[PDB]
Design a protein around this ligand. Structure first.
Ligand SMILES: Nc1ncnc2c1ncn2[C@@H]1O[C@H](COP(=O)(O)OP(=O)(O)O)[C@@H](O)[C@H]1O
Length: 216
């Protein structure tokens, strides 16, 4: 059954800024999410080098990008370390980190919205292009859970019993805004990924039409 959580106030203000901004460089969400996937993969590769068993639920490292024109969603999937239920609650809303508070104080003092691009807003950049965001995650030390938020001051976390099992990793599902459908186009995606992927040392694949295309 679903549990509801309140966004930390600072995180709520960050989301508020993101949702109301006219910042035109929205495409940066893609680099933020792919970097997150790379970091999560970093972690499971690191943990498993001295302990190969940690790879058993999913032996291959990958990042997959799946645009879906039928329901206007863009999905970023990885087989990284994944998040436990507590991880989703702790890392995706309830706790405002040092950097986040510093970013908010800085941007409020300067009003310089180019900071969004210069310093980044991490995972929350998804709300630059999406109305609603879903996160399915599976970590070795817990069952599969689902995090959801339409950015209304709250999010929910629900033990997953409807979706296909990931084995290990994370699936970020962006429900794109009506005016942001360009990010379903494969050329748009490839050009963005090419721009930010030189030093991502995991295989990146794009779902095309259907077949998987290698981006690196
Ligand atoms: N794809 C992912 N797999 C596993 N954990 C993730 C993923 N994306 C985000 N997280 C967790 O959410 C946290 C917050 O993400 P973010 O706001 O991008 O900050 P940062 O990238 O600086 O960690 C990350 O530190 C990470 O712990």
């Amino acid at each position: 059954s679903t549990e509801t959580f309140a966004f930390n106030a600072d995180i709520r203000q960050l989301m508020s800024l993101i949702i109301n901004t006219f910042y035109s460089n929205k495409e940066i969400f893609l680099r933020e999410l792919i970097s997150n996937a790379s970091d999560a993969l970093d972690k499971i590769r690191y943990e498993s080098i001295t302990d190969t068993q940690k790879l058993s639920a999913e032996p291959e490292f990958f990042i997959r990008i799946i645009p879906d024109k039928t329901n206007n969603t863009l999905t970023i999937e990885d087989s990284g370390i994944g998040m436990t239920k507590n991880d989703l609650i702790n890392n995706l809303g309830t706790i405002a980190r040092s950097g986040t508070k510093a970013f908010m104080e800085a941007i409020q003092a300067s009003g310089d919205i180019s900071m969004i691009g210069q310093f980044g807003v991490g995972f929350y950049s998804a709300y630059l292009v999406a109305d609603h965001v879903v996160v399915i995650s599976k970590n070795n030390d817990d069952e599969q859970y689902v995090w959801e938020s339409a950015a209304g001051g709250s999010f929910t976390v629900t033990k997953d019993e409807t979706n296909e099992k990931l084995g290990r990793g994370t699936k970020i599902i962006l429900h794109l805004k009506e005016d942001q459908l360009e990010y379903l186009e494969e050329k748009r995606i490839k050009d963005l990924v090419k721009k930010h992927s030189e030093f991502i040392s995991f295989p990146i694949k794009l779902y095309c039409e259907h077949e998987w295309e290698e981006l690196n």
